[PDB]
Design a protein around this nucleic acid. Structure first.
Lengths: 185, 147, 135, 259
RNA sequence: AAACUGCGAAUGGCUCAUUAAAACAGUUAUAGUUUAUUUGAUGGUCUACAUGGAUAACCGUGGUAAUUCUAUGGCUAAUACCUGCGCACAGUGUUUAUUAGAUACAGAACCAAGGUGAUUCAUAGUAACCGAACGGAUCGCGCUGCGACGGAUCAUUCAAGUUUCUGACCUAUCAGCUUUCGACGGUACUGUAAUGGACUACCGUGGCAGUGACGGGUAACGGGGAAUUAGGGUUCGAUUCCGGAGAGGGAGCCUGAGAAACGGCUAC
RNA sequence: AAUUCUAGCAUCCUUCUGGACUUUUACUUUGAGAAAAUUAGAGUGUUUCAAGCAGGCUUGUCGCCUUGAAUACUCAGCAUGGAAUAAUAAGA
RNA sequence: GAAGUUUUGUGAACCUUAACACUUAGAGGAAGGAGAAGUCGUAACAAGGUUUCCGUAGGUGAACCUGCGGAAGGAUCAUU
């Protein structure tokens, strides 16, 4: 199969490396699941140890943590927007780690109304306390909410876990990727 | 500074900390340099800044080139005994080796100590710990020092 | 003279491996030509068939006809002349009869009275000594 | 290759068992509390030390009676690794054997009293926090005692009760505490601890002093604290881990054999 | 008896064709990981006097020239296979975000404490995520004891995989090798049991060599060792032990803790 | 008294209560750790011997010798005492 | 969850071309040594009957010969 070993390929000197052994199962690799958007499917691959490792193939949804507010919501995905490594993966909408993705933002907007009551577009006391405790929201995130979208980095490896998780972009990361979206335009 | 296609960010610092900088203390009787703490560079593979343990061995030697990016190559010299003739023999091995951009102006023919770590690429196993400025005249690869 | 100094291992070690080849006996061991040369395969003994019965004359001063045999080794079919030890025994050989060949004891080269490096130890497996003795 | 080796060979066995060269091609192979080369299997106690069994067959006939115990627990497997500072208890005969290291560097079953054969010592490998934030020792034996004192650190011994699970008496690892060696060149030697060097990186070593004022060193993995500065929690074997010299061991031996 | 289930069959044995910084040897590292079993730990939190329907052997019955080929029909089991309530919103685990994880000195005034040489380690806490995993529908001797089996996490042990440094026979009638199709490095994926040009995108132009690179020869598996009567050496080591590789030649793969297995299978 | 090793006093550090500094190694010394078999070798009348790791005492019976099967050997690497020799560094 | 099927990777096997390695035939040419005695000279060893020899060049049945510059290993350690 796919040999991960160093017995093939050159030495540092530029010399062929002698090989007197057949391929070994512990020097294994497997074909890469370029997982994407769509309705959910996932395949348990039996690995070394007996231990199972769940290969993503299509993922609709994911758990995405807002960092500053300290909450996380289950959310549907819309599209893959940017990738650092390969522009072909954005072309096909392929979910990988470090991949920048669009997100519904109606879970966060419903929470932000309920928690604070400043909104976007007996308790009251609890809301005020929460506001004092924690709601200004960046100027760019204010514009971003108006579309009904957010931007977020995929943090999990979908191929290993069988799960798209991530975190929402904010501050310097958000200002950075807004350059290289606008530059291609 | 953001040179590259992906956002270069230091792990250790959370997104809550966006002023704060992470710096490790590597131990083994090696002091953390000041330019690691003060400066704003990233490096994944730095001992003092990122996830890499130093562990096992420590190797001194002479730097012979600094051409490739964030990495050097360090000529070790040693005598090899030849028991028939009862007499020594000068050999060498070029260890290729990581270095971090806390160390400014690492000239050719400098002395450098370097601890072992996990394999970062194919050729490099070792990472730098500390450097010393000295001049060497003519060729560097001629210069035999034993340490 | 030599270099005496402590760090002169290369010059001492290199000079031996180069000038070992100046020996005649070292080259006969360590070259690759030992395996192609000889009709034997770096071996003690070898069987073969007697293609012809032959007679050769010793170089002066000694004069006579020495009675040797031309043989083809079974493995390589390489012709060689093998001397037959002791009085007569020529009658014993029989053309086309298998005969054991052994070194003359001089590591090839030559023996005494021309250009023969082998001796026929056995005929039909009987051996020369048994018959000459008649035991 | 391809998996774990089920046979071990004679000769490729440990020397300190003292299995002979002839009379077998293979040797018994001990996994249990202890390592392969820092233990001795229960067969070669019974046949090649205590001389109860003759054969490998007869050890099965002994052990499947359920007469042998270790640590107040019946072990049915004949090739069980019974190592340093384990108690053995046979109910018939009513005699108990604590395995210590002999001065030469061999295992020997030291016979002991009935009240003494309750307890045993375990030097702790490290201390570590388990789930629900509870602390927990782990031993050289591969037990894991939990809820200790905060007092108890790495590289020191604890008297276990065995009749119950719990600890009783701690000991500390310091200068002026009695200490046996369990491995290496100086095995079977007991002396007070003078000093330890740190070497911040790998392999701490300890110099320590025999009761006849002989000084000698070992790594900390080998060193095993018995008791306080002079005195000891346990009973010791013949010679008490002095290790007298080569010419002395000659002189005492041939003086014996003339009777 | 037979048959299903469990466990073993990856050990042992045999051979030396490959193979020249490869293997192996001594020496590190695993904070870069998997581990049946053994030994010791831990854990109420999700019709509970008990859930479901098929399968042998067996009986009836055939096919084919022929085998460790087997079809159709009829029954019946489980520690086989698959489901599955539960306090004494709510456990443990997975996946991401993230706070604590202190330590060279004493304090004063004002307001709204595990563990390493060393970490992002152990562990606790917060906010959610999934079902794809645990929280026993099992068995024997005798309000109540003992141990057989199952299975999760954490050590432990038998290991294994990589990995640091140093080390080899002849040859220069072998002096320049390596690279766009990974050569040396960088960033970010992917893949793996995990680390890595191991692999893929872009980016830089490096890396090795006169101390012998690259290539060729070996009637070369390596070492522990063997022969050889000063000392220094020279030659041998297929072969009792420890590694390594192979089962006519190559390649592929299932099952399992573990095999790229050959007294297992598929193809040329 | 020879032969070892070591404290003082001729102007000789200190931060503390063993380690930090003395440029750095090589070198030498002692020590760690390194499988046995083989090899040298302690003990022992396998009838001798090559071998082997056994045995030896004794009308005593929970037999005894708190029985023996020692020990050495195994460039590079880790550690350490030291005043020469030789590299190497430098030149408040 | 079967047969069949889409695109990938792993990839045996066979073939074309080329290079490298190793055996091997060949009319004719032209070496070396061996015979065991032949034919033609006489080159060297004595000032060997033109002293011997070196480097280089040309010529001749063959040894060899001659030109130019060297050497004594010469047949002279030596005479305004």
């Amino acid at each position: 199969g796919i040999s991960r070993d160093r017995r093939h390929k050159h030495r540092r000197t530029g010399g062929r490396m002698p090989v007197h052994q057949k391929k070994r199962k512990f020097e294994l690799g497997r074909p890469p699941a370029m997982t994407k958007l769509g309705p959910k499917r996932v395949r348990p691959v039996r690995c070394r140890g007996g231990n199972m490792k769940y290969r993503a193939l299509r993922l609709d949804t994911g758990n995405y943590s807002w960092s500053s507010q300290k909450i996380a919501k289950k959310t549907r995905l819309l599209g893959v927007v940017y990738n650092a490594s390969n522009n072909e993966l954005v072309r096909t909408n392929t979910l990988v780690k470090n991949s920048i993705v669009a997100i519904d933002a109606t879970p966060f907007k419903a929470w932000f109304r309920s928690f604070y009551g400043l909104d976007l577009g007996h308790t009251l006391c609890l809301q005020n306390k929460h506001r004092q405790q924690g709601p200004k929201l960046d100027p760019l995130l204010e514009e971003q909410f108006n579309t009904g979208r957010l931007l977020a980095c995929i943090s999990s490896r979908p191929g290993q876990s069988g799960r798209a998780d991530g975190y929402i972009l904010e501050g310097e990361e958000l200002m950075f990727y807004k350059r290289k979206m606008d530059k291609k335009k | 500074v953001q040179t590259e296609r992906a956002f270069q960010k230091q792990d250790g610092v959370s997104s809550l900390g966006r002023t704060q900088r992470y710096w490790k203390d590597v131990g083994l009787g090696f002091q953390t340099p000041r330019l690691a703490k003060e400066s704003k560079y990233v490096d994944k593979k730095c001992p003092f800044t990122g996830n890499v343990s130093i562990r096992g061995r420590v190797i001194k030697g002479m730097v012979i080139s600094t051409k490739m990016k964030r990495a050097v190559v360090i000529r070790r010299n040693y005598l090899h005994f030849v028991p028939k003739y009862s007499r020594f023999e000068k050999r060498h091995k070029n260890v290729t080796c990581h270095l971090s951009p806390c160390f400014e102006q690492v000239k050719e023919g400098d002395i450098v100590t370097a601890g072992q770590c996990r394999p970062l690429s194919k050729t490099i196993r070792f990472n730098v710990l500390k450097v010393e400025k000295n001049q060497v005249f003519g060729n560097v690869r001629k210069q035999f020092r034993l340490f | 003279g030599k270099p005496n100094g402590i760090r002169t291992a290369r010059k001492l070690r290199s000079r031996r491996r180069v000038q070992k080849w100046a020996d005649k006996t070292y080259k006969k061991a360590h070259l690759g030509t030992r395996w192609k040369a000889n009709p034997f395969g770096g071996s003690s003994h070898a069987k073969g068939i007697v293609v012809e019965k032959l007679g050769i004359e010793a170089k002066q001063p000694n004069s006579a006809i020495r009675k040797c045999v031309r043989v083809q080794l079974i493995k390589n079919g390489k012709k060689i002349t093998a001397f037959v030890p002791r009085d007569g025994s020529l009658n014993y050989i029989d053309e086309n009869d298998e005969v054991l060949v052994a070194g003359f004891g001089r590591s090839g080269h030559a023996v005494g009275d021309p250009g023969v490096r082998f001796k026929v130890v056995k005929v039909a497996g009987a051996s020369l000594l048994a018959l000459f003795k008649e035991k | 290759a391809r998996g774990p080796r089920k046979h071990l060979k004679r000769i490729a066995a440990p020397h300190h068992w003292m299995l002979d060269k002839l009379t077998g091609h293979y040797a018994p192979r001990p996994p249990g509390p202890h390592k392969l080369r820092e233990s001795a299997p229960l067969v070669v106690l019974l046949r090649n030390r205590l001389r109860y069994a003759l054969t490998y067959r007869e050890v099965m006939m002994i052990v499947m009676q359920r007469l042998i115990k270790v640590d107040n627990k019946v072990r049915t497997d004949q090739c069980y690794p019974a190592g340093f500072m384990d108690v053995i208890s046979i109910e018939k005969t009513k005699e108990n054997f604590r395995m210590l290291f002999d001065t030469k560097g061999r295992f020997v079953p030291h016979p002991i009293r009935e009240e003494e054969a309750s307890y045993k010592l375990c030097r702790v490998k490290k201390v570590v926090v388990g789930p629900k934030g509870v602390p927990a020792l782990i031993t050289h034996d591969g037990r894991t005692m939990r809820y200790p004192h905060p007092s108890i650190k790495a590289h020191d011994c604890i008297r276990l009760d065995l009749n119950t699970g719990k600890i009783v008496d701690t000991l500390k690892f310091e200068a002026g505490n009695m200490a046996m060696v369990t491995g290496g060149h100086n095995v079977g030697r007991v002396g007070v601890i003078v000093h330890r060097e740190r070497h911040l990186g790998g392999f701490d070593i300890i110099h320590l002093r025999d009761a006849k004022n002989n000084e000698f060193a070992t790594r900390i993995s080998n060193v095993f604290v018995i008791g306080k500065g002079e005195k000891a929690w346990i009973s010791l074997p013949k010679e008490k881990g002095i290790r007298l010299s080569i010419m002395e061991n000659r002189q005492v031996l041939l003086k014996k054999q003339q009777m």
